[PDB]
Amino acid sequence: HHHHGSKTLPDKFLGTFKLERDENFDEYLKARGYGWIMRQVIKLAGVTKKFRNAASGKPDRYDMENLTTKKDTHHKDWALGEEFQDEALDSTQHKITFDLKDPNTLTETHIKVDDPTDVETYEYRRDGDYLVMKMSWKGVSTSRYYKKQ
Ligand SMILES: CCCCCC/C=C\CCCCCCCCCC(=O)O
Protein backbone atom coordinates (compact mmCIF):
# COMPACT_ATOMS: atom_id res chain seq x y z
CA HIS A 1 0.00 0.00 0.00
CA HIS A 2 1.07 3.55 -0.98
CA HIS A 3 -0.33 5.55 2.11
CA HIS A 4 2.14 4.31 4.82
CA GLY A 5 5.33 6.44 4.67
CA SER A 6 6.45 6.53 1.06
CA LYS A 7 5.47 9.40 -1.32
CA THR A 8 3.24 8.74 -4.40
CA LEU A 9 4.26 10.28 -7.74
CA PRO A 10 1.21 12.27 -8.98
CA ASP A 11 -0.26 10.84 -12.30
CA LYS A 12 0.59 14.33 -13.76
CA PHE A 13 4.23 13.13 -14.03
CA LEU A 14 3.55 9.66 -15.47
CA GLY A 15 3.99 8.94 -19.16
CA THR A 16 6.10 9.85 -22.20
CA PHE A 17 7.20 13.45 -22.84
CA LYS A 18 8.99 14.64 -25.98
CA LEU A 19 11.32 17.73 -25.99
CA GLU A 20 9.70 20.39 -28.25
CA ARG A 21 11.38 23.73 -27.31
CA ASP A 22 13.33 25.52 -24.58
CA GLU A 23 14.25 29.06 -23.45
CA ASN A 24 17.77 30.33 -22.61
CA PHE A 25 19.33 26.80 -22.75
CA ASP A 26 22.52 28.13 -24.45
CA GLU A 27 23.46 30.70 -21.76
CA TYR A 28 22.71 28.03 -19.10
CA LEU A 29 25.09 25.53 -20.80
CA LYS A 30 27.67 28.35 -21.02
CA ALA A 31 27.32 29.10 -17.22
CA ARG A 32 27.84 25.32 -16.67
CA GLY A 33 31.15 25.51 -18.64
CA TYR A 34 30.29 24.07 -22.06
CA GLY A 35 32.21 25.39 -25.09
CA TRP A 36 30.46 26.17 -28.40
CA ILE A 37 30.77 22.66 -30.06
CA MET A 38 29.44 20.77 -26.99
CA ARG A 39 26.58 23.27 -26.53
CA GLN A 40 25.34 22.79 -30.12
CA VAL A 41 25.17 18.97 -29.81
CA ILE A 42 23.66 19.12 -26.30
CA LYS A 43 20.98 21.73 -27.18
CA LEU A 44 19.86 20.39 -30.53
CA ALA A 45 19.59 16.72 -29.53
CA GLY A 46 16.18 14.98 -29.43
CA VAL A 47 15.03 14.01 -25.90
CA THR A 48 12.19 11.72 -24.81
CA LYS A 49 11.50 11.34 -21.08
CA LYS A 50 9.56 8.39 -19.69
CA PHE A 51 8.20 8.05 -16.18
CA ARG A 52 6.28 4.94 -15.14
CA ASN A 53 5.29 2.79 -12.10
CA ALA A 54 8.15 0.25 -11.65
CA ALA A 55 7.93 -2.68 -14.15
CA SER A 56 8.83 -4.93 -11.13
CA GLY A 57 5.37 -4.14 -9.62
CA LYS A 58 6.74 -2.75 -6.32
CA PRO A 59 4.25 -0.07 -5.04
CA ASP A 60 5.56 3.59 -4.83
CA ARG A 61 8.61 2.51 -6.90
CA TYR A 62 9.24 4.04 -10.33
CA ASP A 63 11.24 3.80 -13.53
CA MET A 64 12.48 6.73 -15.56
CA GLU A 65 14.30 6.88 -18.88
CA ASN A 66 16.07 9.67 -20.70
CA LEU A 67 16.16 8.67 -24.38
CA THR A 68 18.33 11.00 -26.50
CA THR A 69 19.94 11.01 -30.01
CA LYS A 70 23.07 9.42 -28.49
CA LYS A 71 23.29 8.44 -24.78
CA ASP A 72 20.28 6.88 -23.00
CA THR A 73 19.78 6.49 -19.19
CA HIS A 74 17.54 3.92 -17.47
CA HIS A 75 16.84 4.35 -13.72
CA LYS A 76 14.87 1.33 -12.40
CA ASP A 77 12.93 0.77 -9.15
CA TRP A 78 13.56 4.12 -7.47
CA ALA A 79 11.49 5.71 -4.67
CA LEU A 80 10.80 9.41 -3.94
CA GLY A 81 13.31 10.72 -1.32
CA GLU A 82 15.59 7.65 -1.70
CA GLU A 83 19.10 8.27 -3.13
CA PHE A 84 20.56 5.73 -5.63
CA GLN A 85 23.76 5.55 -7.71
CA ASP A 86 23.65 5.16 -11.53
CA GLU A 87 25.16 6.21 -14.85
CA ALA A 88 24.03 9.66 -16.04
CA LEU A 89 23.87 11.22 -19.59
CA ASP A 90 27.52 12.40 -19.31
CA SER A 91 28.50 8.62 -19.09
CA THR A 92 29.66 8.98 -15.47
CA GLN A 93 28.28 7.71 -12.11
CA HIS A 94 26.04 10.13 -10.18
CA LYS A 95 24.12 9.95 -6.92
CA ILE A 96 20.48 10.70 -7.89
CA THR A 97 17.40 11.46 -5.80
CA PHE A 98 13.90 12.14 -7.14
CA ASP A 99 11.63 13.89 -4.63
CA LEU A 100 8.41 15.94 -4.35
CA LYS A 101 8.59 19.55 -3.14
CA ASP A 102 4.72 19.61 -3.27
CA PRO A 103 2.15 17.74 -5.51
CA ASN A 104 2.92 20.05 -8.50
CA THR A 105 6.78 19.90 -8.15
CA LEU A 106 9.08 16.96 -8.89
CA THR A 107 12.81 17.49 -8.16
CA GLU A 108 15.81 15.45 -9.42
CA THR A 109 19.13 16.02 -7.69
CA HIS A 110 22.47 14.83 -9.11
CA ILE A 111 25.72 14.64 -7.19
CA LYS A 112 28.82 13.65 -9.21
CA VAL A 113 30.56 10.59 -7.65
CA ASP A 114 34.05 11.76 -8.86
CA ASP A 115 33.22 15.42 -7.88
CA PRO A 116 31.01 15.47 -4.68
CA THR A 117 31.09 19.33 -4.77
CA ASP A 118 29.13 19.25 -8.07
CA VAL A 119 25.47 19.24 -6.78
CA GLU A 120 22.56 20.24 -9.04
CA THR A 121 18.73 20.08 -8.74
CA TYR A 122 16.29 19.98 -11.75
CA GLU A 123 12.61 20.88 -11.27
CA TYR A 124 9.65 19.45 -13.23
CA ARG A 125 6.19 20.98 -13.46
CA ARG A 126 3.14 20.18 -15.51
CA ASP A 127 1.59 23.01 -17.50
CA GLY A 128 -1.30 21.80 -19.64
CA ASP A 129 -0.02 19.21 -22.14
CA TYR A 130 3.56 20.10 -21.17
CA LEU A 131 6.10 18.92 -18.65
CA VAL A 132 8.39 21.94 -17.97
CA MET A 133 11.93 21.19 -16.78
CA LYS A 134 13.62 24.13 -14.99
CA MET A 135 17.33 24.52 -14.19
CA SER A 136 19.52 27.28 -12.74
CA TRP A 137 23.32 27.75 -12.56
CA LYS A 138 25.27 30.83 -11.31
CA GLY A 139 22.06 32.96 -11.63
CA VAL A 140 21.38 31.72 -15.21
CA SER A 141 17.87 30.06 -15.57
CA THR A 142 16.39 27.86 -18.35
CA SER A 143 13.04 26.08 -19.07
CA ARG A 144 12.73 23.04 -21.42
CA TYR A 145 9.24 22.10 -22.72
CA TYR A 146 8.30 18.37 -23.19
CA LYS A 147 5.01 17.63 -24.90
CA LYS A 148 2.99 14.80 -23.32
CA GLN A 149 2.61 11.92 -25.88
C1 LIG B 1 23.53 16.21 -19.48
C2 LIG B 1 24.83 16.57 -20.16
C3 LIG B 1 25.26 15.54 -21.20
C4 LIG B 1 26.71 15.71 -21.64
C5 LIG B 1 27.23 14.66 -22.61
C6 LIG B 1 26.44 14.58 -23.92
C7 LIG B 1 27.05 13.66 -24.93
C8 LIG B 1 26.69 13.55 -26.20
C9 LIG B 1 25.61 14.34 -26.88
C10 LIG B 1 24.19 13.96 -26.42
C11 LIG B 1 23.22 15.12 -26.50
C12 LIG B 1 21.84 14.83 -25.94
C13 LIG B 1 21.66 14.96 -24.44
C14 LIG B 1 21.45 16.39 -24.00
C15 LIG B 1 21.07 16.54 -22.54
C16 LIG B 1 19.58 16.48 -22.24
C17 LIG B 1 19.27 16.78 -20.78
C18 LIG B 1 17.89 16.39 -20.33
O1 LIG B 1 16.92 16.52 -21.03
O2 LIG B 1 17.83 15.92 -19.10
Numbering used by the authors: -5 to 143
Task: Pull text from the paper.
Using a micro-focus beamline, a dataset was collected with diffraction observed to beyond 2.2 Å. Due to clear evidence of radiation damage, the data were processed and scaled to a maximum resolution of 2.3 Å. As-p18 crystalized with two near-identical copies of the protein in the asymmetric unit (coordinate RMSD 0.19 Å for all equivalent heavy atoms), but with incomplete electron density in the ligand-binding pockets. In the crystal structure of As-p18, the electron density associated with the co-purifying ligand was of insufficient resolution to determine its conformation unambiguously. The electron density within the binding pocket indicates that a single resident fatty acid molecule could be in a U-shaped conformation as observed for other FABPs, and sit with its charged head group either buried within the protein’s binding pocket, or pointing out towards the pocket’s opening. The head group buried orientation is the more likely given the precedence set by other FABPs and our NMR data. Since As- p18 predominantly co-purifies with vaccenate, we fitted this ligand into both copies of the protein in the asymmetric unit. In E. coli, these are principally 18:1 and for As-p18 almost exclusively vaccenate (cis-11-octadecenoate). In both the NMR- and X-ray-derived structures, the N-terminal residues Asp5-Phe7 form a 310- helical loop that is an extra secondary structure element characteristic of the subfamily IV in mammalian FABPs. The βB-βC loop is poorly defined in solution, consistent with the high crystallographic B factor values for this region, but there is limited evidence for flexibility from the 15N relaxation data.
